[PDB]
Each structure stands twice: as C-alpha cells, then as structure tokens.
Ligand binder design. Structure first.
Ligand SMILES: *C/C=C(C)/C=C/C=C(C)/C=C/C1=C(C)CCCC1(C)C
Length: 137
C-alpha cells in the first residue's frame, strides 16, 4: 500500500525485444532503450485510486485510475486503449489493455512493491516481457 512516492530506475531490460514485436526500427529502438533507461516514476496512491506520473528526459505522461474501473491510456506504440487494473496479491497489480480501434498484439502491464522496497514494473506484448526496477528516491 506504500506505492506512493518518488521512484528512480536501477534496471531496464528486454526493452528492445518488446519494441521489435511492433515494428520499431533498430535506431528508434536503440534511442528508445536509452530513453527508457532514464525513466522516473511518481506515484500517489489513496486506497484503490492511483496517480502515476512517468517521465523521461523530454516526455512525461500521467495516468489516473481506480482499481476495477476502466480508463483510457496508450499502448507502448501510442495506440489508445481502454485498461482495467486488478490486484493479484497485496502488492502487485495487473493491467489488461484492449485496443479501441483495430487489431494488434495483446498488451498488459504490472506493478509490484517487493518486501525489499523495490518497485517492479513489467510490460508485456504477446510472448515478450519487459521489466523495470526502481528504488525510492
Ligand atoms: C509505472 C509505469 C512505468 C514505469 C512506465 C514506463 C513506461 C515506459 C518505459 C514507456 C516507454 C516507451 C513507450 C511507451 C513508447 C515511446 C518510447 C518508450 C520506449 C519511452
């Protein structure tokens, strides 16, 4: 329940192979990998209500949602989707996404607070899972 806080990244991996699944170019993949490696996360949690600001060097994005309540966001490659977060356990939530227009890969993300005090974020596209690890700032 202590998801709230300021998180700085310490590990980011399998990122390029997630981007490959969609057709991101090698160059755009590489600069995406470097960008993804500077991510910062700001979380404000109030019960089942979440504000998450994730930012890189030149881009920042916010989401607000309630567990169980569909909301709108963007997949990895910017396609708008409706999303639904559910709890898996005390400190891990899973988010299913469904494309609002057309077809594409099945995408989903997770967030978890470990007992070591790490925030683990994963993002999935079909068979492929990226993972990022953060510590409190
Ligand atoms: C809790 C949520 C987190 C840690 C979200 C992190 C999001 C990213 C690392 C997103 C990365 C990318 C895209 C969605 C598309 C544009 C390029 C990237 C690689 C920065």
């Amino acid at each position: 329940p202590n998801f709230s806080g300021n998180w700085k990244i310490i590990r980011s991996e399998n990122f390029e192979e997630l981007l490959k699944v969609l057709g991101v170019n090698v160059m755009l993949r590489k600069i995406a990998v470097a960008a993804a490696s500077k991510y910062a996360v700001e979380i404000k949690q109030e019960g089942d209500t979440f504000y998450i600001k994730v930012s890189t060097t030149v881009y920042t994005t916010e989401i607000n949602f309630k567990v169980g309540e569909e909301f709108e966001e963007q997949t990895v490659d910017g396609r708008p989707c409706k999303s639904l977060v559910k709890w898996e356990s005390e400190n891990k939530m899973v988010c299913e996404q469904k494309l609002l227009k057309g077809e594409g890969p099945k995408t989903s993300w997770t967030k978890e607070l470990t007992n070591d005090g790490e925030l683990i974020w994963t993002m999935t596209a079909d068979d492929v899972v990226c993972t990022q690890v953060f510590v409190r700032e």
